Amino acid sequence: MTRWVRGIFEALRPLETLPVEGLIRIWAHEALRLFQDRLVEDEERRWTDENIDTVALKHFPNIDREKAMSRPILYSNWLSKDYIPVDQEELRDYVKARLKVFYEEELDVPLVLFNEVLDHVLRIDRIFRQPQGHLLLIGVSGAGKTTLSRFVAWMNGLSVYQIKVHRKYTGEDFDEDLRTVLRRSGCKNEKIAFIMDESNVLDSGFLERMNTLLANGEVPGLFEGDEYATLMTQCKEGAQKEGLMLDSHEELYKWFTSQVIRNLHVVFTMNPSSEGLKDRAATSPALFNRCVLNWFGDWSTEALYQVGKEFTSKMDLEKPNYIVPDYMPVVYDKLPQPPSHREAIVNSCVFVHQTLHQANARLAKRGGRTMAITPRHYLDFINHYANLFHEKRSELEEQQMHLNVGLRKIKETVDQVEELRRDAKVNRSTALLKSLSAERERWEKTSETFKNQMSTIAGDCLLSAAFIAYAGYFDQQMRQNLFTTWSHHLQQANIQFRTDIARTEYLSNADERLRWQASSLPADDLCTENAIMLKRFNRYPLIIDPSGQATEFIMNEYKDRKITRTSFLDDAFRKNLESALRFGNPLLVQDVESYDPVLNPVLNREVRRTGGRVLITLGDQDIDLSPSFVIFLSTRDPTVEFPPDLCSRVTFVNFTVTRSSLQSQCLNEVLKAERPDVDEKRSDLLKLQGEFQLRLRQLEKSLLQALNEVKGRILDDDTIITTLENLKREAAEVTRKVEETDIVMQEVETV
Amino acid sequence: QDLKGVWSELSKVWEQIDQMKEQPWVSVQPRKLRQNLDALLNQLKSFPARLRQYASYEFVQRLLKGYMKINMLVIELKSEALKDRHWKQLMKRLHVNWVVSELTLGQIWDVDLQKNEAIVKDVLLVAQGEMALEEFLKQIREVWNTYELDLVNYQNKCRLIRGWDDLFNKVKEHINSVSAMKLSPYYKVFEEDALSWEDKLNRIMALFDVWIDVQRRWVYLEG
Numbered sequence A: 001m002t003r004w005v006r007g008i009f010e011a012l013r014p015l016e017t018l019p020v021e022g023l024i025r026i027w028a029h030e031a032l033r034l035f036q037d038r039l040v041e042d043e044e045r046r047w048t049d050e051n052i053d054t055v056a057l058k059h060f061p062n063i064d065r066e067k068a069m070s071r072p073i074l075y076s077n078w079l080s081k082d083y084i085p086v087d088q089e090e091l092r093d094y095v096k097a098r099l100k101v102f103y104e105e106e107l108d109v110p111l112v113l114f115n116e117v118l119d120h121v122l123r124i125d126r127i128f129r130q131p132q133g134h135l136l137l138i139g140v141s142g143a144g145k146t147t148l149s150r151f152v153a154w155m156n157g158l159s160v161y162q163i164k165v166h167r168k169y170t171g172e173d174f175d176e177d178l179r180t181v182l183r184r185s186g187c188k189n190e191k192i193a194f195i196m197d198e199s200n201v202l203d204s205g206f207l208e209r210m211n212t213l214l215a216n217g218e219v220p221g222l223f224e225g226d227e228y229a230t231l232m233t234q235c236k237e238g239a240q241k242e243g244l245m246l247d248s249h250e251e252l253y254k255w256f257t258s259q260v261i262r263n264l265h266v267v268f269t270m271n272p273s274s275e276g277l278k279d280r281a282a283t284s285p286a287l288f289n290r291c292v293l294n295w296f297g298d299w300s301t302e303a304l305y306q307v308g309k310e311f312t313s314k315m316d317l318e319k320p321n322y323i324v325p326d327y328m329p330v331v332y333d334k335l336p337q338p339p340s341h342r343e344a345i346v347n348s349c350v351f352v353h354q355t356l357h358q359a360n361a362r363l364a365k366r367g368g369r370t371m372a373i374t375p376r377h378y379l380d381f382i383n384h385y386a387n388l389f390h391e392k393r394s395e396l397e398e399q400q401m402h403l404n405v406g407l408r409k410i411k412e413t414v415d416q417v418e419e420l421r422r423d424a425k426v427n428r429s430t431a432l433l434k435s436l437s438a439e440r441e442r443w444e445k446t447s448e449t450f451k452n453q454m455s456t457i458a459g460d461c462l463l464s465a466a467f468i469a470y471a472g473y474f475d476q477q478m479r480q481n482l483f484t485t486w487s488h489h490l491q492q493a494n495i496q497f498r499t500d501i502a503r504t505e506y507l508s509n510a511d512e513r514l515r516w517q518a519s520s521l522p523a524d525d526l527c528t529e530n531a532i533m534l535k536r537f538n539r540y541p542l543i544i545d546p547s548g549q550a551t552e553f554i555m556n557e558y559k560d561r562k563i564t565r566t567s568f569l570d571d572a573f574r575k576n577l578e579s580a581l582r583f584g585n586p587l588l589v590q591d592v593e594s595y596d597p598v599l600n601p602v603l604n605r606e607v608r609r610t611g612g613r614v615l616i617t618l619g620d621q622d623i624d625l626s627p628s629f630v631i632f633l634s635t636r637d638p639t640v641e642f643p644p645d646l647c648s649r650v651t652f653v654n655f656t657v658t659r660s661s662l663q664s665q666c667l668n669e670v671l672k673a674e675r676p677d678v679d680e681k682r683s684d685l686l687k688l689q690g691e692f693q694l695r696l697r698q699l700e701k702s703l704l705q706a707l708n709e710v711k712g713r714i715l716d717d718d719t720i721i722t723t724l725e726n727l728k729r730e731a732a733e734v735t736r737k738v739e740e741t742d743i744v745m746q747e748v749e750t751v
Numbered sequence B: 001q002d003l004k005g006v007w008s009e010l011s012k013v014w015e016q017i018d019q020m021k022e023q024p025w026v027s028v029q030p031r032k033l034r035q036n037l038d039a040l041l042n043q044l045k046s047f048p049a050r051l052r053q054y055a056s057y058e059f060v061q062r063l064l065k066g067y068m069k070i071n072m073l074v075i076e077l078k079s080e081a082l083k084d085r086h087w088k089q090l091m092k093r094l095h096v097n098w099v100v101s102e103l104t105l106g107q108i109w110d111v112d113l114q115k116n117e118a119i120v121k122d123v124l125l126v127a128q129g130e131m132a133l134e135e136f137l138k139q140i141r142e143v144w145n146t147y148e149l150d151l152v153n154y155q156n157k158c159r160l161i162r163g164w165d166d167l168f169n170k171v172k173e174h175i176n177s178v179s180a181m182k183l184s185p186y187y188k189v190f191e192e193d194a195l196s197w198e199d200k201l202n203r204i205m206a207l208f209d210v211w212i213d214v215q216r217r218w219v220y221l222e223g
């Protein structure tokens, strides 16, 4: 109530004339910033939103409610001054401009400014623009806590300063770091936005000192001995700078303390956890007394859809022949009707995110082990989508260009042979012309198939990326269920994709699979999918496996790149990280349960690129990051729990055998050991997804290489046609496989 | 006429700018420079709109605005970071031949700092790393040259040493920091002194690790 009063007073101070509607508007905004801000779920937020208007109308009749309480309640001083109310759209334009400027100086990584972010920025600014404005942010990892904190700190002149924690982090290092931050804040009179995660909060020793610093405004016992004398030496200089000459030690000490209150804001970025929140309430009341707290958890559907739209701008997603389906499966209510191709794809992506939340909730209800799902998973998924779309479109484009060059060469060769005919040999030439024409129509059919693949590429890439980035912790059955759910949702969207897409082959080639089989890796579908994920990832993978096949597998895969083994328990881990960054060799890490917070900059990919240099901040030292560096995290106990901050930085690769993985393994073993013919037919069905076409492409490349030398010598018997009839026979074989795929598929299903 | 008047005002402004630019870079105070240039901008705005519409006035106004924009570049340049080697790198990359003693604000202003913002920022960050490591080394020398052993009496027989934990912790943190400093591209400067201090730290660590055992055994056997 007193904060309500003070906020109303501060908002009313610069104004001279103000109608009653403006007063009740300020009243409502301040109540929202005090009461609705701390709420957790949506029901309480709606309850507050409706009852504030109810109270306002019940105590203030005969006033217009539209201007008095407008739905986009929002206050700031950025535009003009005097804390005047600002419209949402003009504020959005201003924050876009400031974000673009920020992109110029710091954090070039794109951010999307939706309504939630627009509100949180103003809340953070309002708390910062206040003496002793310590603040606590609560939200799931990747929701934009630290990012928005640093953005607002930069915008306000606050020099962001965050401590970094690692293992064996003694209290003396922490005390030195507080000494440094207080010296920078008070003695030198620069405002500091002091920021941290939950990782360095877990130790209870630091919480006492922070409790004193937050409540009193200054921690006794941190400054003593010669350090206190030095502190006094620059405290006198600071007093001289402000023209506040003082000589007694205690008055200067109070002046330094007051400088600390006026020029130090502490920000706590922390993961929602009811039991942990209760524990930290028990051990530190100042986190709830002095530190006003902000809630923002999972991104709303509108935030996800806006992120999807913004991050799929370079991607083509423009099908002029896209037929809008009746009864569109929609999860975003404000979807344009009729939606375009890009709108439908982004809606499907939001559906994938929401349905995986649903699957996680269902699995938790079943009593199984679940891992927290964060918006960083959505960002990683959209990155996989962009990368896969670009890569597949490129591969198809060079394949089509190769086909066109081959067709032009074939036409030139046909013209040359016609000119030669113009001059038994004639029969051979006529047969050559017939075969060349036949293979020409065959390549026209190949162009038709290429166009069909170009049609299906969008759905194929979406399913592939959704599997790689999202799934991986779940067993084989849950992965298959999620893939089917996505497939049915997209077929309800009339989006084009292969109905019998194979995830293992569409995401790799024959050579990589044989290379994996050369290393220690069983021929299991789960193992193949996990190796697929290990091949392609944006966030460094975390490996869970009870038998240890993955560790030796990724050793054998990266032996040529001098991969090294080191665990968290070993004290040489930090030195091995230094060596890996300096040289660039891969480094597998075991025993991930006893996580070391030193890897957070590595996992977060906090790279500083300036002046032809790339830097990574481990400890208080900057290290040149080698371009070819990669790290793998591994463990051995499946029944372990991970902090969601870790879960939001690594992609899970699960090797644990379940009631569905072993069932499939035994079924495949029986098929290969009892009904071999069915095994080769199933292999032919599975490898029809490009591998036969890949062999045809390679052999056609060899044929073009041979045919390039066409002058007389190619007519040794006027028939070099052996290579082209060979091509014709494998082409007929693969075509016969294509026509007869359904019958063989049904037979394999029956067996 | 109006053209003659605006030409005279432009000549006065150019003379003022040239007189300010004659100040050597060593004696150019960024705060006073910003205040005086703001005064010049206020003087320029005092001209009538008819004199403001002239192209030359617009050119001088936009030049002063660019000086405003690069004033923070000037502030970062005028510090304890550039020294003389970073200035040498800047001259080498910008292909300009200046004199350090005769360096003035005019010569730097002639080179487009706004166009070369990336180069200047890279030099500033390199200098920041170099000055950070230099101050770390200065702290090393100031803490090891003034450090004294904690001597304490032993029943009027001798004067022994206490405080082993603090000294050993300082040595370990120091040796770890020095070893880690071998990383980073900034390590290429002052390498020889770094290795010399490495040798000094190893020597003191080994000597005192032997000394603690010697002292403990001597106290026990004397008892």
Ligand SMILES: Nc1ncnc2c1ncn2[C@@H]1O[C@H](COP(=O)(O)OP(=O)(O)O)[C@@H](O)[C@H]1O
Pocket: A109, A110, A111, A112, A113, A114, A117, A140, A141, A142, A143, A144, A145, A146, A147, A197, A269, A307, A376, A379, A645
């Ligand atoms: N509004 C947004 N639009 C797009 N990307 C965002 C947005 N907010 C955050 N991000 C991305 O998500 C990440 C947020 O991480 P952060 O919230 O700082 O983690 P933590 O809360 O654990 O410190 C950033 O890397 C940023 O790129």
